[PDB]
Amino acid sequence: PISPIETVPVKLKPGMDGPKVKQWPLTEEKIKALVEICTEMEKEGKISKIGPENPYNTPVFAIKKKDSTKWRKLVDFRELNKRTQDFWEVQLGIPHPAGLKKKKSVTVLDVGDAYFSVPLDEDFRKYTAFTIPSIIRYQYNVLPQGWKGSPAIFQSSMTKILEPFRKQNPDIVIYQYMDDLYVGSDLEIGQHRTKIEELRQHLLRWGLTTPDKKHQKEPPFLWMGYELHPDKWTVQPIVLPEKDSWTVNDICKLVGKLNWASQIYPGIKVRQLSKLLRGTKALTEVIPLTEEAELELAENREILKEPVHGVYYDPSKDLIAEIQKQGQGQWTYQIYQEPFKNLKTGKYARMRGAHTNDVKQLTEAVQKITTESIVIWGKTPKFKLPIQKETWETWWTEYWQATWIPEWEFVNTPPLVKLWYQLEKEPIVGAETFYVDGAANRETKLGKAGYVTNRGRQKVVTLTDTTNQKTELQAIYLALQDSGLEVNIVTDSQYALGIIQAQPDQSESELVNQIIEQLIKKEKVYLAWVPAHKGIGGNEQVDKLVSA
Amino acid sequence: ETVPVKLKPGMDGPKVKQWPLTEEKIKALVEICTEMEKEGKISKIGPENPYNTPVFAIKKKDSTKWRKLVDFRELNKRTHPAGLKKKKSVTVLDVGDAYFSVPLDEDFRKYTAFTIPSINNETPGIRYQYNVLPQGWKGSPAIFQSSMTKILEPFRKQNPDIVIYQYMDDLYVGSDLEIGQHRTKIEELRQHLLRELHPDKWTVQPIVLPEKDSWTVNDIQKLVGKLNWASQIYPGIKVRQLSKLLRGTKALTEVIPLTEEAELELAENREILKEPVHGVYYDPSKDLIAEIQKQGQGQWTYQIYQEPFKNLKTGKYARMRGAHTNDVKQLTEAVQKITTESIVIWGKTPKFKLPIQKETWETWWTEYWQATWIPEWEFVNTPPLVKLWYQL
DNA sequence: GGGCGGCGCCCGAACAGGGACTG
DNA sequence: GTCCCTGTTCGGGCGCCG
Ligand SMILES: Nc1ccn([C@H]2C[C@H](O)[C@@H](COP(=O)(O)OP(=O)(O)OP(=O)(O)O)O2)c(=O)n1
Ligand SMILES: [Mg+2]
Ligand SMILES: [Mg+2]
Numbered sequence: 012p013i014s015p016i017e018t019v020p021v022k023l024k025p026g027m028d029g030p031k032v033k034q035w036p037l038t039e040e041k042i043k044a045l046v047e048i049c050t051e052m053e054k055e056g057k058i059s060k061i062g063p064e065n066p067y068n069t070p071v072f073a074i075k076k077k078d079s080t081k082w083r084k085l086v087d088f089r090e091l092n093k094r095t096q097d098f099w100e101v102q103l104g105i106p107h108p109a110g111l112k113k114k115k116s117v118t119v120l121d122v123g124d125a126y127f128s129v130p131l132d133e134d135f136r137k138y139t140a141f142t143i144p145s146i147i148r149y150q151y152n153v154l155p156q157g158w159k160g161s162p163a164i165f166q167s168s169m170t171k172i173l174e175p176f177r178k179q180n181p182d183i184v185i186y187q188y189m190d191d192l193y194v195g196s197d198l199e200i201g202q203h204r205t206k207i208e209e210l211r212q213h214l215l216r217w218g219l220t221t222p223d224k225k226h227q228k229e230p231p232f233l234w235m236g237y238e239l240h241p242d243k244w245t246v247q248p249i250v251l252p253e254k255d256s257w258t259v260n261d262i263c264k265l266v267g268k269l270n271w272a273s274q275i276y277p278g279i280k281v282r283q284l285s286k287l288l289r290g291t292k293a294l295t296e297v298i299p300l301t302e303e304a305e306l307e308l309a310e311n312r313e314i315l316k317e318p319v320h321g322v323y324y325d326p327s328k329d330l331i332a333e334i335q336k337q338g339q340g341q342w343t344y345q346i347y348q349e350p351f352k353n354l355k356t357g358k359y360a361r362m363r364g365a366h367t368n369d370v371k372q373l374t375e376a377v378q379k380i381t382t383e384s385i386v387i388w389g390k391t392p393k394f395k396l397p398i399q400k401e402t403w404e405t406w407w408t409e410y411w412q413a414t415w416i417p418e419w420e421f422v423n424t425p426p427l428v429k430l431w432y433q434l435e436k437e438p439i440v441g442a443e444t445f446y447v448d449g450a451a452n453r454e455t456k457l458g459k460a461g462y463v464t465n466r467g468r469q470k471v472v473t474l475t476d477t478t479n480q481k482t483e484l485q486a487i488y489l490a491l492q493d494s495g496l497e498v499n500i501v502t503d504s505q506y507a508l509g510i511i512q513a514q515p516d517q518s519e520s521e522l523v524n525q526i527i528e529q530l531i532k533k534e535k536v537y538l539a540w541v542p543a544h545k546g547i548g549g550n551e552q553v554d555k556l557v558s559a
Numbered sequence: 560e561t562v563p564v565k566l567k568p569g570m571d572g573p574k575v576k577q578w579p580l581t582e583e584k585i586k587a588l589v590e591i592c593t594e595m596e597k598e599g600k601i602s603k604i605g606p607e608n609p610y611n612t613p614v615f616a617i618k619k620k621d622s623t624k625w626r627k628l629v630d631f632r633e634l635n636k637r638t639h640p641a642g643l644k645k646k647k648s649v650t651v652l653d654v655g656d657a658y659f660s661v662p663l664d665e666d667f668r669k670y671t672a673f674t675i676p677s678i679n680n681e682t683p684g685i686r687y688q689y690n691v692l693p694q695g696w697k698g699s700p701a702i703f704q705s706s707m708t709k710i711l712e713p714f715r716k717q718n719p720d721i722v723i724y725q726y727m728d729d730l731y732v733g734s735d736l737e738i739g740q741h742r743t744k745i746e747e748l749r750q751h752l753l754r755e756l757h758p759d760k761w762t763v764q765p766i767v768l769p770e771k772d773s774w775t776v777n778d779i780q781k782l783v784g785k786l787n788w789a790s791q792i793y794p795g796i797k798v799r800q801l802s803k804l805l806r807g808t809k810a811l812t813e814v815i816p817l818t819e820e821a822e823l824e825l826a827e828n829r830e831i832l833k834e835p836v837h838g839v840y841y842d843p844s845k846d847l848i849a850e851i852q853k854q855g856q857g858q859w860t861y862q863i864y865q866e867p868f869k870n871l872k873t874g875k876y877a878r879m880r881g882a883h884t885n886d887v888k889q890l891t892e893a894v895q896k897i898t899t900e901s902i903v904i905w906g907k908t909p910k911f912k913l914p915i916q917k918e919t920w921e922t923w924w925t926e927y928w929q930a931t932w933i934p935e936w937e938f939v940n941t942p943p944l945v946k947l948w949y950q951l
Numbered sequence: 952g953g954g955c956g957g958c959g960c961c962c963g964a965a966c967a968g969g970g971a972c973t974g
Numbered sequence: 975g976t977c978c979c980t981g982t983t984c985g986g987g988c989g990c991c992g
Contacts, residue, residue: 021607074953165992465809
């Protein structure tokens, strides 16, 4: 039937008119499917025959419905979508099985012909004109598939339709993805079935049928890409492409399946694979796998060959997130309540900043996990982290930004997160003092880096194709190279000071990485700043040196 | 009877995605919004309205009541008693409820749309829009002002030594009475309204130079850096004789004895840093900028300026020393204290340059917020230089 | 084979803000 | 101002759901 719910008023964007687009050639198979669909829709008033008073058209097609021998009618409304008003999407996220609680009784219902059961605004119907070619012209009186307004209008209409049932039945849980309903209740199987009949009769009153073919009554329930057993849930199998020559399209498919997988498979890593896509120009381009990517992919394959499940949420217990470090700024995590029973898993790998270290990355991973936990369970978890309370305290003292981790507890699973070197707060007695500088010429791109020391040493290196900042960093690198285990360095560069003060252990800059090697090898470093070009200290001397 | 309100020309309404809320906040929002719907203050709407502003809720201390908070910063973007800062005590009453007694221009309602989320996305968002003057909207005090003046006229007549200032949802009531009589008069005003700060004791944080009787090359280098920077605020500062002691290429820990000239230069400079900053005039057409620096050990410095190096105010906030402290909680309370000061002094909120990561802030700041307004802010990664310059 | 919305990931292009620089 | 460096956003591919 067609829902007697009120329509949602819809307008075109000002000054725009309906689309006028020739219809495509289609196969005879698609023509037969379309006419079988359209004869029946026209009988039911879901579509209306139109005449020459309607000067609009949009091309149509069909595709096999993904898990059936039935067809789906779709319209290429790209022009109409360009010309249709804006909506506010009401679907804010995707429900996750790890957020479901234990229920006595569970049902899964699909609404039959979901969009085609929800009326479309009268005034707008005329712009939905289409043509079924020969071997007939129509307009939609219901929501079409391919129009940008149909998801939001459907999701909102379904919410309105279910509100009276929810008000009457507060303690029956209805997870509502588009027309999928997961219905859970704390009733015996008998009273539950009775309430599900009440719900199907309520939906049918509002024009929505629930065909038995998609009425799931017994576990395991197929829902949202998952298998829901009574006390555990799993993912429907992941199949990774197994090719020999890889293209950017294949790689994106692999990385997408692996990301999807990482929600219940622990240990998934996609860094080297994702790095393959760096300089690409098109989806068709072929990329040879690096040895690193090859080996990472084999590891992921081994991980996926293993049987794994999640569990459901008990509100009367704490949420615990546990984090493990992989290399290259890659982290996995596991959220659980009881020791070896994961609610879910995850990975964080985002590279934030030219220069960083593992304490910053771990703080970002904590933040991500906290926001994700708020979305799924509505509260924050307690943390198990591989970082000493002492390490964290040191960082949080020395660091100039506000930073904070919620309730947490050390875990002794290597690799532990550490700070790899610490700058002194006070200058070092008996360490030689290097005054460093760099200058670069903006026209020719030639530069000098250099130092002068208080014990008489002076060195200048010349550089090609360089910049001011790079010569400052290069001078600091030269001083680290040519000093002993303890060294005072004086710089005029806010740039370099800010970088090194923040204690990076990784950088996209080769030069900063070389500096970091040096700073980890040293025993004590002290980095002081003076303002440039004020005739201060040995800064004047090394400045006169590196200008020429 | 309604009052038409328009948007600034060339501007559409806000389209701001709602952020995730905790279960307690969603439950409070749903109960509050249900009552507000029963009373006609808000109406359910659909996705054909393309506008949205985020919403959350705060639980006031010493109270199990939640108060809803709509972040109208964008919408507000798109639409003074100088004796209040001198009063012995100042109480801050919440009069937002009054606004729900006045209807909102129909053509404007669409711009106040907001969406309530759900745990684990059990349902799509539930969308509402306002039928009355909403709390937290710039236009609410403006349109209600005349009714407010009529409400407060006789209380102001009977108490002329009391200063009543209105900012967005708040009344500031200032008095020189003793604390008990002040609270008595405040409850008198609460009774009348059915038709605790102490600003006289706020402190400027001057820039301070180190005092010692043995200086090293490093000490003098640090002092010359600090004075060179400070001379952009105070032109009286001079560094010739102090930097003269640094000639050559010396060891950082070499002890340098100060000359007579440089000692005079240092004493004259530390005097100069006491004088007030010259030529600083508040412009109401520009916005206040507030910078905050984490000094460590629960200490925070802040500067309110409008043009660079022309500080209208410079202060510090202190808090619990570092046993179980929360940097973000403290940064948030510092933001609220600074905003309160700025509202009282100039009647306007500052735009904060916050020394925190965007994500850390947005993850946690709503757990410690207790005000009914929200200032604008941007996020910053400062060099430790300004930190040292304002440090103590 | 193609159309739509949501969320996720990763990458790069566009743009903004602040420091250093030339005569 | 210009050149440089760095951070944010937004749009494009793919994954997943319907
Ligand atoms: N590839 C897809 C899958 C779904 N949908 C939209 C339109 C569908 O009508 C709705 C729900 O998906 P279904 O597969 O349940 O479609 P129907 O409800 O029309 O079919 P059925 O009666 O077989 O359930 O989501 C879509 O636009 N494109
Ligand atoms: Mg269906
Ligand atoms: Mg230099």
